[PDB]
Structures are given as C-alpha cells and as structure tokens.
C-alpha cells in the first residue's frame, strides 16, 4: 500500500497531572518479513521526546535530522529546546518537502520547563500541529489505538498509574495487528526523572 503501512510501527503518547507517557513497538518489518524486534523508535534530543512512525528510512533519517537542528538550537540559545517550540520545528521540517514528503507520522511529548504544563502533539505526512492534551496515536494500528486509548483514558493521572493506562492501551492493540507488536518500550517522563520500562509481552 502506502510505504508508511508497509514497514509499520506504532507510537502512542498520553497526558496526566504533571506527567506524559510515550511508548512505541520495537518491530521493524519490511513487508511480512520481520527484520528486527529490538530496534526502538523513540528518541529524544534534550528532555523533549520524539516518536516517529512510518517508513523506516525516513524514520532513522528524520531522527538524525531533528537531532541535528536541536543541537544547533541548544548552543545558540544556551538552553535546551522546549516542547512548545519543538512542536513548530517539527511542522517546519515536514512542510519543506510537500511534493516529495517524508513518509512519517511524528508524535511529540514532553513537559515544558517554563511552566511545567504537560504537553503533547500529533503530526502527519506533510505535517501540522494537531493539538490535544488527551492522547496522540500514529502508526499502522492507529485506528485500533484511537478507540482503545479513549476508553482507558481518564485525566489527572499519577505517573505510576499513567503507566498502567498506556501499557494496556498499546499491548492488546499491537497484538491484534500484524505489522506492530513484537516487543515494546515505554518512557514515563515525570519532570526530572525519566523511567524507561520495557514491556514483557507475547510475540506476534
């Protein structure tokens, strides 16, 4: 189909009271052949965390690319980039190729340093800020994740409970998709601790 649908991978982020959660699968697929089960998809540049779903080649190159812009940012300003400001950077990079765009769907997660508000945003092929403070999903199982997350979600969650909510959301949805699953990983960003917790789970 779409090159984005072929390679696969899911990214889902969530909000709570002074916390955000962002999780991914570890699957790399090239068509039905599973390549890798242990390649992550979420990266981070500073304390702002980025996911990228879609075609693999653009997922690694766009990891490299946004790293590249944020490290210039950091040096210039003499401070780490904020999520709020990183959400615009993300749209700008995507819009720069309209008619040969990168096949990806970025998800931004963080919590601001200037206000401490929790922050999340969604993107698309050619990109725009798609604002919520509920949850953002992307990927091949994005349609499963969109309903599945909404039932489970409640607002004003504690960081430890927010983990329970995301974990459940991702695992069952992932399981019932062919091009996702295959191991997972979740980052819970409190404020100044990030705990990184890898989901033990059934293989697909």
């Amino acid at each position: 189909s779409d090159p984005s649908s072929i390679n696969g991978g899911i990214v889902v982020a969530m909000t709570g009271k002074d916390c955000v959660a962002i999780a991914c699968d570890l699957r790399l697929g090239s068509q039905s052949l599973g390549v890798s089960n242990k390649f992550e998809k979420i990266f981070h540049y500073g304390h702002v965390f980025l996911g990228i779903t879609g075609l693999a080649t653009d997922v690694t190159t766009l990891n490299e690319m946004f790293r590249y812009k944020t490290n210039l940012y950091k040096l210039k300003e003499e401070r780490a980039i904020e999520p709020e400001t990183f959400t615009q950077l993300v749209s700008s990079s995507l819009y720069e190729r309209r008619f040969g765009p990168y096949f990806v769907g970025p998800v931004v997660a963080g919590i601001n340093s200037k206000s401490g508000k929790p922050f999340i945003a969604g993107f698309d092929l050619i990109g725009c800020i798609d604002e919520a403070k509920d949850f953002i999903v992307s990927g091949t199982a994005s349609d499963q994740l969109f309903g599945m997350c909404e039932s489970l979600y409640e607002p004003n969650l504690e960081p430890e409970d927010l983990f329970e909510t995301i974990s459940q959301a991702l695992l069952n949805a992932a399981d019932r998709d062919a091009l996702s699953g295959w191991g997972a990983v979740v980052y819970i960003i409190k404020k100044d601790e990030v705990v990184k917790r890898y989901l033990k789970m059934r293989q697909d």
Binding site: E64, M65, R67, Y68, N71, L72, L75, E78
Partner: protein, 241 residues
C-alpha cells in the same frame, strides 16, 4: 603596495596582508589554553570593561562548538562570529553523517582550510582571529590546538594568543610541570593573565573561564563554562583578591 591585493605576494617572499592580520590579534586580549592529562582549562580575557558594562549575564569569548569541543576567542568578534557559526555547523554535520562526535583534529583542519581559501581566492579579506581549540575525542584523549590567522594549526601543551604573546609564553614555560593537575593549570592561567593585563586587581567580571573534564561519569565529558560568581571564589583561593 602589496597590501593592494591579497592574491599577490611581495618581492621579499612574504605576504604583508597576512602579517598585517597577525598584528590585528595584538589589539585584542590574551587567551590561554593549557592542556593537562586531567583536563583542559580554557581561559579568556575581556578586553573591554566599564561599570555600566553588562558582562555578568553573558559569555562572548567562550563558545561551545558541539557537546565536547569549545573555543576561546581572541581577535575581532565580527571576524569570529562568521567562522564559529560555520564550525558549529560542520562539526555537528559530522555527527549526523557518521553518528559520532567530530574529532578535534579534523574540525580544526576544516576551519584552517577555509581561512587559506579567503587569502587564495577572490578579493575577500583574510580573517584576523586566532582561536584556541579544546576538545575530547577517544582517539587521542584530551586534545588541544590553536589556529593562526594564516590558516594553519599546531599542537600545544600550553599556548597563548592575543596581546603580549611573547611575555606570556615566557611566563608559562617557566612554571609548567609535565603531568600537571587541572587545578594547578587554572591557577597558572590566572597568575599569567594578571601580569599581561593592566587590570591589576584582575576581577571576576573581567575573566571568562571554561574547564573540560571527564569527571562527569566515565567515557562522558562535561564541558563547564564557569559563571561569574564562581570566578570570584577561585581568585580568593589563589589570593589575588
């Protein structure tokens, strides 16, 4: 005469334009890099002060290049601006491509070539800025270099650029000890800036300072620009104030 173009040589078989640019660096203040096996101290002087000069909220003779290489600045700041920006861009261009931080040696080399090109080609001015580079890359540990205005580089274990070079150098090599310590190097720097600079008190707000240390974790380097009030505490310890 043979200042008239940059692309012409003198009958002596020097180039007056480059020599002249070298004299540009002696109308700006001293910068001292000392390498020690336990760290590099980077030291710089602010050549302009006043009592209304804001200088306590700013760094401007200390610029971080990436996460593991930083420079000290001596010369024209306008000259400095364009090359620092370019260097930052290339060093991190290497990061993207190769997925490793740039080796110290290659990035100086890149930047010294660009300097030679401005003399070699067109009707552009050569740049009268001497940068002391301090980095860490695994292939030679701590690495110190400094660059001439001509467009060439040499390694050092300690070096001084800026004004009153000849005197300053004299003072350093008299008091160097081959193993050294990171703390003893800082102390050596201050001793030297004190004497070359005519600001006898030699206060915190007249000093910029950065130390590069691997003490933060292992295999991981932390570059720490000293902030003004900290610069004031270490002058008490060395006794200057």
């Amino acid at each position: 005469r043979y200042d008239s173009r940059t692309t012409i040589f003198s009958p002596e078989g020097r180039l007056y334009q480059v020599e002249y640019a070298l004299e540009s660096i002696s109308h700006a203040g001293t910068a001292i890099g000392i390498m020690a096996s336990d760290g590099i101290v980077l030291a710089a002087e602010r050549k302009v002060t006043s009592t209304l000069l804001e200088q306590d909220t700013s760094t401007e003779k200390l610029y971080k290049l990436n996460d593991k290489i930083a420079v000290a600045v001596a010369g024209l700041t306008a000259d400095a601006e364009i090359l620092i920006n370019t260097a930052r861009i290339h060093a991190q261009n290497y990061l993207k491509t190769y997925n490793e931080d740039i080796p110290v040696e290659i990035l100086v080399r890149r930047l010294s070539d660009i300097k030679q090109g401005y003399t070699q080609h067109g009707g552009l001015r050569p740049f009268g800025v001497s940068f002391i580079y301090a980095g860490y890359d695994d292939r030679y540990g701590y690495q110190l270099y400094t660059s001439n205005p001509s467009g060439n580089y040499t390694g050092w274990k300690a070096i001084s650029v800026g004004a009153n070079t000849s005197a300053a150098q004299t003072l350093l090599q008299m008091d160097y000890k081959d193993d050294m310590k990171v703390d003893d190097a800082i102390e050596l720097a201050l001793k030297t800036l004190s004497k070359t600079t005519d600001s006898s008190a030699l206060t915190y707000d007249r000093l910029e300072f950065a130390t590069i240390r691997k003490g933060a974790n292992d295999g991981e380097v932390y570059q720490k620009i000293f902030k003004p009030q900290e610069i004031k505490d270490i002058l008490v310890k060395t006794g200057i104030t």
